[PDB]
Design an enzyme around this catalytic site. Structure first.
Site, PDB file in Angstrom:
ATOM      1  N   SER A  23       0.657  -1.147  -0.011  1.00 45.89           N
ATOM      2  CA  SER A  23      -0.091   0.062   0.015  1.00 45.89           C
ATOM      3  C   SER A  23       1.054   1.402  -0.058  1.00 45.89           C
ATOM      4  CB  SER A  23      -0.847  -0.063   1.129  1.00 45.89           C
ATOM      5  OG  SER A  23      -0.381   0.176   2.384  1.00 45.89           O
ATOM      6  N   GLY A  24       0.390   2.385  -0.526  1.00 42.65           N
ATOM      7  CA  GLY A  24       1.102   3.671  -0.874  1.00 42.65           C
ATOM      8  C   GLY A  24       0.317   4.689  -0.305  1.00 42.65           C
ATOM      9  N   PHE A  26      -1.960   6.589  -2.140  1.00 42.01           N
ATOM     10  CA  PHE A  26      -3.084   6.682  -2.934  1.00 42.01           C
ATOM     11  C   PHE A  26      -3.940   5.462  -2.678  1.00 42.01           C
ATOM     12  CE2 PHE A  26      -0.094   9.012  -5.682  1.00 42.01           C
ATOM     13  CZ  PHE A  26      -0.867  10.293  -5.706  1.00 42.01           C
ATOM     14  N   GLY A  27      -3.634   4.428  -2.067  1.00 43.37           N
ATOM     15  CA  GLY A  27      -4.182   3.329  -1.967  1.00 43.37           C
ATOM     16  C   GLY A  27      -3.482   2.060  -1.722  1.00 43.37           C
ATOM     17  N   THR A  28      -4.284   0.914  -1.512  1.00 39.36           N
ATOM     18  CA  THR A  28      -3.981  -0.513  -1.031  1.00 39.36           C
ATOM     19  C   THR A  28      -3.799  -1.384  -2.384  1.00 39.36           C
ATOM     20  OG1 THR A  28      -4.448   0.122   1.160  1.00 39.36           O
ATOM     21  CG2 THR A  28      -4.174  -2.307   0.499  1.00 39.36           C
ATOM     22  N   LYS A  48      -6.337  -1.894  -7.215  1.00 41.24           N
ATOM     23  CA  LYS A  48      -5.814  -0.686  -6.240  1.00 41.24           C
ATOM     24  C   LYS A  48      -7.109  -0.206  -5.641  1.00 41.24           C
ATOM     25  CE  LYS A  48      -2.319   1.751  -6.089  1.00 41.24           C
ATOM     26  NZ  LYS A  48      -0.875   2.080  -6.910  1.00 41.24           N
ATOM     27  N   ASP A 135       4.227  11.948 -10.800  1.00 41.19           N
ATOM     28  CA  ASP A 135       4.469  11.075  -9.864  1.00 41.19           C
ATOM     29  C   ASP A 135       5.622  10.018 -10.115  1.00 41.19           C
ATOM     30  OD1 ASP A 135       5.144  10.510  -7.017  1.00 41.19           O
ATOM     31  OD2 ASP A 135       2.755   9.550  -6.801  1.00 41.19           O
ATOM     32  N   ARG A 139       9.285   3.593  -6.804  1.00 42.50           N
ATOM     33  CA  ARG A 139       8.063   2.804  -6.459  1.00 42.50           C
ATOM     34  C   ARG A 139       7.118   2.582  -7.424  1.00 42.50           C
ATOM     35  NH1 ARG A 139       7.955   7.859  -4.036  1.00 42.50           N
ATOM     36  NH2 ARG A 139       6.437   9.186  -4.507  1.00 42.50           N
ATOM     37  N   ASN A 140       6.924   3.370  -8.639  1.00 42.37           N
ATOM     38  CA  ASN A 140       5.926   3.447  -9.543  1.00 42.37           C
ATOM     39  C   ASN A 140       6.628   2.831 -11.008  1.00 42.37           C
ATOM     40  OD1 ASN A 140       3.603   4.808  -8.290  1.00 42.37           O
ATOM     41  ND2 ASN A 140       4.650   6.743  -8.289  1.00 42.37           N
ATOM     42  N   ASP A 153       0.852   3.733 -12.293  1.00 42.81           N
ATOM     43  CA  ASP A 153      -0.039   4.798 -11.634  1.00 42.81           C
ATOM     44  C   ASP A 153      -0.341   6.174 -12.323  1.00 42.81           C
ATOM     45  OD1 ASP A 153      -0.634   3.275  -9.353  1.00 42.81           O
ATOM     46  OD2 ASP A 153       0.605   4.459  -8.074  1.00 42.81           O
TER      47      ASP A 153
HETATM   48  C1  LIG Z   1       6.911  -0.679  -4.348  1.00 46.96           C
HETATM   49  C2  LIG Z   1       5.299  -0.962  -4.517  1.00 46.96           C
HETATM   50  C3  LIG Z   1       4.848  -2.058  -5.192  1.00 46.96           C
HETATM   51  O1  LIG Z   1       5.314  -2.827  -5.211  1.00 46.96           O
HETATM   52  N1  LIG Z   1       3.789  -1.631  -6.002  1.00 46.96           N
HETATM   53  C4  LIG Z   1       3.135  -0.548  -6.308  1.00 46.96           C
HETATM   54  C5  LIG Z   1       1.939  -0.783  -7.047  1.00 46.96           C
HETATM   55  N2  LIG Z   1       0.730  -0.491  -7.869  1.00 46.96           N
HETATM   56  C6  LIG Z   1       0.365  -1.334  -8.329  1.00 46.96           C
HETATM   57  C7  LIG Z   1      -0.961  -1.054  -9.118  1.00 46.96           C
HETATM   58  C8  LIG Z   1      -1.211   0.058 -10.103  1.00 46.96           C
HETATM   59  C9  LIG Z   1      -2.692   0.345 -10.512  1.00 46.96           C
HETATM   60  C10 LIG Z   1      -2.685   1.279 -11.377  1.00 46.96           C
HETATM   61  C11 LIG Z   1      -2.061   1.358 -12.847  1.00 46.96           C
HETATM   62  C12 LIG Z   1      -2.357   2.172 -13.610  1.00 46.96           C
HETATM   63  C13 LIG Z   1      -3.277   3.299 -13.377  1.00 46.96           C
HETATM   64  C14 LIG Z   1      -3.792   3.313 -12.138  1.00 46.96           C
HETATM   65  C15 LIG Z   1      -3.568   2.465 -11.283  1.00 46.96           C
HETATM   66  F1  LIG Z   1      -4.182   2.462  -9.983  1.00 46.96           F
HETATM   67  C16 LIG Z   1      -3.296  -0.488 -10.156  1.00 46.96           C
HETATM   68  F2  LIG Z   1      -4.739  -0.552 -10.617  1.00 46.96           F
HETATM   69  C17 LIG Z   1      -3.180  -1.756  -9.448  1.00 46.96           C
HETATM   70  N3  LIG Z   1      -2.092  -1.907  -8.975  1.00 46.96           N
HETATM   71  N4  LIG Z   1       0.795  -2.348  -8.401  1.00 46.96           N
HETATM   72  C18 LIG Z   1       0.593  -3.765  -9.040  1.00 46.96           C
HETATM   73  C19 LIG Z   1       0.930  -4.902  -8.322  1.00 46.96           C
HETATM   74  C20 LIG Z   1       0.895  -6.083  -8.934  1.00 46.96           C
HETATM   75  N5  LIG Z   1       0.345  -5.920 -10.212  1.00 46.96           N
HETATM   76  C21 LIG Z   1       0.381  -4.887 -10.898  1.00 46.96           C
HETATM   77  N6  LIG Z   1       0.427  -3.711 -10.297  1.00 46.96           N
HETATM   78  C22 LIG Z   1       2.004  -2.262  -7.496  1.00 46.96           C
HETATM   79  C23 LIG Z   1       3.362  -3.104  -6.870  1.00 46.96           C
END
Ligand SMILES: *CCC(=O)N1Cc2nc(-c3cc(-c4ccccc4F)c(F)cn3)n(-c3ccncn3)c2C1
Length: 298
Positions: A23-24, A26-28, A48, A135, A139-140, A153
């Site tokens: 989780s960061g 913006f969300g989990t 997310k 951003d 991490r992104n 993101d």
């Molecule tokens: C160091 C942090 C980490 O390991 N991760 C951060 C993270 N975010 C996501 C992710 C991103 C999105 C997303 C993508 C495009 C636009 C908007 C947006 F919210 C999402 F919908 C869901 N997850 N991940 C992630 C983890 C595993 N597979 C894919 N994405 C991480 C990992």
């Protein structure tokens, strides 16, 4: 008004969050399972769920779903209820920041330079579309396979990373493609230091005056002066003096052709890019999508 067919509207009944990934701000992030209508199958997805208008959220989500590039994570589905849930392709390897930390002093020069190339190609695509990420940070940046990274993101910042922000963004909330270049320089610095935190021990409030004095991030021990000069160039005060993503792709690709001449890594002759055998395996199993060839050492 982009293509509405790129964003699939998901109902709470078609999917379920199963595991916690992280989780960061913006969300989990959850590992999910999509059960398509009239089917018995369970399909892994990454979800997310955000921390905190529906017409306006969807308008931004269509732009987020239109990003079609091998180095940019595309938003695939959305579920608007009391919360906002974003769905994308699950990436087992997670983010590059944790990958480089978990592989501290065990990453070859070919990987670092190629990741720098790929991150520049993702951002260059965003600049061609007139889109500002706002951003960029390690991490992104997600790892698809160890040879394929993708920026994540995009659009989440629109809906404060002071230590990744350009001075004009800190002072005047100005975000351009050239402020994204500054963040990119900070991201390259995180990789070269195998995950170090920038300006460690310095309060976020002091950063703007520290920048105005001319202080910048130190030269990572593995970077030659030519690599450091490129990172330094990204943190110029004058935004138009900073390199273009276009120029960073070329410079970093030229450096990838002679990896030992640009990075000094102990035990680097052992750490080479995978054999064609192991890349063919990774590709068929988890990376079928088309991407440009990874730059090989001459
Ligand atoms: C160091 C942090 C980490 O390991 N991760 C951060 C993270 N975010 C996501 C992710 C991103 C999105 C997303 C993508 C495009 C636009 C908007 C947006 F919210 C999402 F919908 C869901 N997850 N991940 C992630 C983890 C595993 N597979 C894919 N994405 C991480 C990992």
């Amino acid at each position: 008004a982009p293509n509405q067919a790129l964003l699939r509207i998901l109902k709470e009944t078609e999917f379920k969050k199963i595991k916690v990934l992280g989780s960061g701000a913006f969300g989990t992030v959850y590992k999910g399972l999509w059960i398509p209508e009239g089917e018995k199958v369970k399909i892994p997805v990454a979800i997310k769920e955000l921390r905190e208008a529906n017409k306006e959220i969807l308008d931004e989500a269509y732009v987020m779903a239109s990003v079609d590039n091998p180095h940019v994570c595309r938003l695939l589905g959305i579920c608007l209820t009391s919360t906002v849930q974003l769905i994308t392709q699950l990436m087992p390897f997670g983010c590059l920041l944790d990958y480089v930390r978990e592989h501290k002093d065990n990453i070859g020069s070919q990987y670092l330079l190629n990741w720098c190339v790929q991150i520049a190609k993702g951002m260059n695509y965003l600049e061609d579309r007139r889109l500002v990420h706002r951003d960029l940070a390690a991490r992104n940046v997600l790892v698809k396979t160890p040879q394929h990274v993708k920026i994540t993101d995009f659009g989440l910042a629109k809906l404060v990373p002071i230590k990744w922000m350009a001075l004009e963004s800190i002072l005047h909330r100005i975000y351009t493609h050239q402020s994204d270049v500054w963040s990119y320089g900070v991201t390259v610095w995180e990789l070269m230091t195998f995950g170090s935190k920038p300006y460690d021990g310095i309060p976020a409030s002091e950063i703007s005056s520290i920048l105005e004095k001319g202080e910048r991030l130190p030269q990572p021990p593995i970077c030659t002066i030519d690599v450091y000069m490129i990172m330094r160039k990204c943190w110029m005060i004058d935004a138009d003096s900073r390199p273009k993503f276009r120029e960073l792709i070329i410079e970093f690709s030229k450096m990838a052709r002679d990896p030992q001449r640009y990075l000094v890594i102990q035990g680097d002759e052992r750490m080479h890019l995978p054999s064609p055998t192991d890349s063919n395996f990774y590709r068929a199993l988890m990376d079928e999508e088309d991407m440009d060839d990874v730059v090989d050492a001459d």
